[PDB]
Amino acid sequence: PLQENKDFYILDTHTQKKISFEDMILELLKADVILLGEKHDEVKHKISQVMIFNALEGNLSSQNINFDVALEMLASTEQNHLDKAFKNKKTIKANELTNALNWDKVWKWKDYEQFVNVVFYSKSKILGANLSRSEITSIYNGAQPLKGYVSTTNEVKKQLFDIISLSHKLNPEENKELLDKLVEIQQFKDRRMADVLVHHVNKVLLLAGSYHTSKKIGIPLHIQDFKSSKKIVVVNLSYGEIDLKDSDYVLIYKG
Amino acid sequence: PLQENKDFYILDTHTQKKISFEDMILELLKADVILLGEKHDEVKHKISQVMIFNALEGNLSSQNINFDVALEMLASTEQNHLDKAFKNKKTIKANELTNALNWDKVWKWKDYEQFVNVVFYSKSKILGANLSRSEITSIYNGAQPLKGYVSTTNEVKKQLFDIISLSHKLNPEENKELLDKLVEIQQFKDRRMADVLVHHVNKVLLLAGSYHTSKKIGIPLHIQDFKSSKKIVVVNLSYGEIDLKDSDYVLIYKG
Ligand code: HEM
Ligand code: HEM
């Protein structure tokens, strides 16, 4: 476990005040949906996810409050299969886990095993949050435009355009048609993950990449468009630059 | 039309001797399969394709020898649809052509209209040479390895690896899994286009990108593996560097 005040600290992004890990937990427990943003290959993020999950799980189970975990890394189409794994929990062994969940190898198991193991064997159910491969391929090949009010603005789409252009080093002029397709795919992924979170009957934590959890361009906008009255809280695990507007709490690593 | 000796010239790549356009034609007429390699957005290539097609078409039709054109830009799965267009030739007007052929818009019509119009309205039939989108998606998601002797060597695959890496500016280390998928897709495209050419009962010209027509890494290797006794000839429309081993004739532009 990372050492608080030696290895990391936490800011409330609204006030920019440093807040204890315990005090952040007490606040997160108030939320109905907790978004946890990560960099997918970042080891310190993976440790942080276990610490936060463990503290929330312990408190909620001791109160008999249901608490589930949605994963950008599993599709929502997989839920029937995942419910079976939840049912057969005691029958799936640590090395059978990836097969039970039908883990997709686009997501390197190494980068997920620690968190997903702790999640899977607690009282939490794992939810698939995302689009399927087939769904993503279908959007790319051209489907009807996503409707929205705050989540689909030109401003959001352009921010997503430039982020993806930079992520893939794709010249905005040469690669215009491709980038607009990738933007629409991000928008659709965000909508689906929001759909899963908005309709869920138990308190829920999402693990997803930082661009997805961002309050500026991501899932939070789509939750708003769904007209949810759920209390939403966003915790981002920092890497590189920190935009306070992206989240409600940020973990900052030493550094 | 480009002016011979002012705008372009032709080398026999075996001898590196300059050869007249008329003398190249007389040789091409001897072949059963003529591969014509292009750069897809290059205007002078497009003019060159019309000149070569016209000279071959005129000679062969005057002899009542059937002569057809296969296109990397249409899938072989489309043939039933394309045979209907061939049948309804006199009923499809210049502006209905793209709809009759079910043209895929990944290929910019502007870059194909001149050649495809001249082809479509002659006595030639248009053949789909390539994989379908669905076929390409299925290979990407993982299918069983292509078998071959000369066409699937590590040497060929590595050349394709580096070509694609450079074409897309994809760092060989970071993007290793992606590049191997793209290599396998090229290999499959080459195999299918070869399959179409090898089994065709009439003399045939293929239009395809230069990497596909290359005798070093492309379709010619797959034709060999099919054990065809057809006479094969490769004509490349140059751009940038010229590797003599890529083709049997090369058009060189001024320059
Ligand atoms: C994420 C979902 C994606 C899907 C479903 C998808 C699917 C496809 C399909 C079906 C094609 C047509 C294949 C062909 O005609 O040869 C294609 C082509 C292409 N794609 Fe995507 N792709 C995706 C992501 C990406 C990304 C992230 C990039 C950029 C890094 C990209 C870059 C390209 C390029 C440059 C081509 C041109 C094909 C070539 O000549 O190599 N794609 N893709
Ligand atoms: C040519 C046929 C292609 C097909 C069928 C295809 C399809 C796909 C699919 C189904 C995914 C998974 C989507 C996801 O999990 O989000 C994907 C991801 C990806 N693809 Fe391809 N693609 C093709 C070509 C390309 C090319 C040419 C490039 C490079 C220029 C490329 C680069 C990428 C990258 C970087 C991703 C990671 C997804 C992301 O995080 O944005 N693809 N592609």
Side-chain angles (χ1 to χ4, degrees), chain A residues 105-123:
Chain A
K105 267 62 197 63
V106 305
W107 300 96
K108 295 172 178 184
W109 179 244
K110 158 154 275 143
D111 290 337
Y112 293 96
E113 72 162 32
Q114 189 189 0
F115 178 67
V116 176
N117 267 70
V118 179
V119 171
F120 187 79
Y121 297 107
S122 58
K123 290 176 159 203

Side-chain angles (χ1 to χ4, degrees), chain A residues 136-137 140-141 168 170 178 182 185, chain B residues 133 136-137 168 189:
Chain A
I136 291 166
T137 304
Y140 190 90
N141 295 331
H168 295 114
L170 268 25
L178 173 65
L182 298 190
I185 286 157
Chain B
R133 290 269 191 87
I136 291 166
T137 304
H168 295 114
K189 286 173 165 174

Side-chain angles (χ1 to χ4, degrees), chain B residues 136-179:
Chain B
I136 291 166
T137 304
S138 178
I139 293 146
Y140 190 90
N141 295 331
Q144 263 253 288
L146 204 69
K147 294 163 203 152
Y149 178 62
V150 302
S151 68
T152 49
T153 67
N154 301 321
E155 189 187 345
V156 169
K157 285 174 173 151
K158 198 265 201 325
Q159 290 171 264
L160 278 177
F161 191 97
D162 301 338
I163 282 166
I164 295 170
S165 179
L166 201 81
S167 289
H168 295 114
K169 296 93 190 284
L170 268 25
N171 173 258
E173 280 76 33
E174 287 165 4
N175 293 281
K176 164 83 177 182
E177 274 167 314
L178 173 65
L179 282 163

